[PDB]
Write a protein that binds this ligand. Structure first.
Ligand SMILES: [Fe+2]
Ligand SMILES: [Fe+2]
Lengths: 408, 404
């Protein structure tokens, strides 16, 4: 429940390319990689349990359904295929429990979220993270990703991004585990990569931006998209994400390192911030925020025969729910009826999950964490009426369940 | 710009099933269909240009990525395959212009949204719509759907739904067009379809909820998920969506119609509310609100060589953006390099669109409304560095661009 500090770093694909091509000795890339060393050092020394990582997906995992604030709630993330195959990096573990605590706090504070699992993290995450963290076999921390829809307008305004972070701060601090959390803000700085203005940069705005974010972040909160894009290029306006990170840190920070390099299209910058704790108690206590985040579902456990589909349940039932969700595909459902065992053997289901499906154990699937709507697809595909499912749930014969209704 | 009223209606697929099986005749379903008739006639008489349509998707088009308020901004919607095939109904048209306006207003009011195009509308929409509107050849009005993520907790608080409705009212009103708009809030009422408690209903609560929604909806705004699920069953809690609709209407309404039937699992209920307009002038004027919405991007037209990816542009570029997105798939990208023309014929791209890709017309694509991250993909697969792309954009030879 302690926030140790935060880091800002650009997230261009070129960082990853330069890492992969081993350009550490390079005349142009050597002082660039050196610019990352203090963050890397800071991260090794401090050993955060979780990094809350703020980035944008570059129209890879987020396109046809494109959200403002997408919290990754899942067990792990692998690098996304972005058009050139999957980068050879190990998957990074998520934190479903922290993520769920964060969702509850943020909803209580009236932020509107999306939740996602199973999708690849693109270079927005894996490019800087590959350079900041050793990953020979695993990664040294867990991750809670927050994908920000900064590309399709309208997007939330600067102050909203800021207010998200303020809320996020209290969210993390009220988490009832004694763990250490770092907050990361990625993308930026000045750049524009489309249209006739492509190739635009503004070092002077970049330096100013870095100073203000560091020491007077409130003075940025009135900037508009038009302002940020005028100053920092079109895609450069993604610095709003840094504001969300800055917003989750103590109102004053110590700037343990900053660096800036502009070798190509994008201003490669980094900033390392040490959290100071709170100069004063927060407006609401950790204990009262916890009880408030819990308020919506307080006393839900007294409702018998009910299994609220909360995040933990979505994560637990993800594999099986994802599998049954594919019944909406004609080929997949044809195979489900005709050759189910071949479909199981290709799948990532546990033997226990396969077993629940094979036995048509309706209540058992409810208990395990299958959401009803996925079971209902399974029933329809198998020609089994919903009434049979309800009777199963109730431990009754079909007619005796039907008796509880009003009309045949 | 004019809100004529709203309806509230259950959205069980059993309604569609009864309609598709011809049960206007049947002892059970005949009274139930007569219950929809006042809403049907009202919609047919009042002729809304657009229905703002509030529903939830039932783990079909929304699952791995599940959002709270998902605004459908696309050109058209067709029935989704929910696992039993695609129901035979014609596509219904969206309204990208009104959707765009609504998004700008709600974002200015600090609601965080999702935008979606092209995915199927499940029975949460097509079930009641197919009973309330003629649809033999096409639908009588356009639709702006709002998919609400009510199934995966935590979900927005009841007051948040209501507050969304409040800002939505102002967004639709201030919309600078002389059109008629009806608001639909759907789902409910009491039901529970999972667990050992499956089959729960509470008619007393349903009737109380309905009366309190019509005449004193602010009395409901402190109801927790536990409260709503206790009184109305776990899935019955989706009635927060009726609140959102109701928040979008006049503080005072005229309840023209209420019906209620409980043949099976769900309380099949309908309400028809006539908007009574604005008693006093609004807190913020229609002209101001339009300017508060446009603010974030006010002045962007000055920035030359720049083509902001706004909702209008995402709609325009959707087929070609969606096409080049598919390059993330290993099979699709192989075919693209090996057999582009065969892939073009089997696509739904316009000739204008294939020609842009075929000629690698980088700047043309940006003008057209292809987002850069899709051209990035294209270039990568074709084996052309971003630099040639950026040079083309800048109308420079690669070497001359390199200088700067
Ligand atoms: Fe980015
Ligand atoms: Fe529903």
């Amino acid at each position: 429940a302690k926030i140790i500090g935060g880091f800002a770093v650009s997230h261009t694909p070129t960082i990853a390319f330069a890492h992969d091509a081993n350009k550490y000795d390079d005349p142009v890339w050597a002082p660039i990689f050196q610019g990352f060393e203090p963050v890397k050092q800071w991260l090794a020394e401090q050993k955060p349990d979780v990094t809350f990582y703020v980035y944008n997906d570059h129209m890879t995992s987020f396109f046809e359904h494109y959200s403002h604030f997408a919290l990754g709630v899942g067990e792990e993330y692998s690098p996304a295929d972005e058009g050139g195959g999957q980068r050879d990096l190990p998957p990074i573990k998520g934190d479903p429990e922290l993520a769920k605590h964060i969702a509850e706090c943020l909803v209580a504070d009236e932020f509107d979220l999306a939740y996602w699992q199973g999708m690849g993290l693109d270079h927005g995450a894996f490019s800087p993270l590959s350079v900041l963290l050793p990953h020979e076999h695993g990664w040294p921390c867990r991750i809670v990703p927050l994908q920000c829809g900064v590309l399709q307008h309208p997007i939330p305004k600067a102050r909203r991004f800021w207010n998200f972070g303020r809320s996020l701060r209290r969210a993390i601090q009220s988490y009832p585990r004694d763990i250490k959390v770092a907050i990361a803000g990625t993308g930026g700085l000045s750049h524009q990569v489309h249209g006739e203005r492509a190739g635009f940069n503004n070092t002077e705005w970049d330096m100013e931006f870095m100073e203000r974010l560091a020491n007077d972040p409130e003075s940025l909160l009135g900037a508009t998209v038009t302002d940020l894009a005028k100053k920092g290029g079109w895609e450069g306006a993604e610095v709003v994400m840094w504001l969300l990170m800055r917003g989750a840190l103590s109102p004053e920070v110590k700037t343990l390192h900053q660096s800036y390099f502009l070798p190509s299209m994008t201003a490669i910058a980094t900033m390392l911030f040490e959290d100071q704790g709170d100069a004063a108690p927060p407006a609401e206590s950790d204990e009262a925020l916890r009880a408030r985040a819990k308020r919506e579902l307080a006393g839900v456990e007294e409702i018998e025969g009910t299994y609220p589909f909360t995040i933990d349940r979505a994560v637990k039932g993800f594999r099986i729910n994802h599998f049954l969700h594919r019944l909406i595909e004609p080929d997949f459902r044809k195979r489900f009826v005709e050759d189910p065992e071949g479909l199981f053997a290709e799948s990532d289901l546990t033997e226990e999950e396969k077993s629940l499906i094979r036995n048509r154990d309706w209540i058992g699937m409810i208990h395990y964490g299958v959401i009803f709507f996925m079971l209902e697809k399974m029933a329809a595909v198998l020609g089994i009426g919903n009434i049979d499912v309800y009777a199963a749930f109730r431990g009754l014969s079909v007619p005796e369940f039907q008796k509880t209704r009003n009309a045949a």
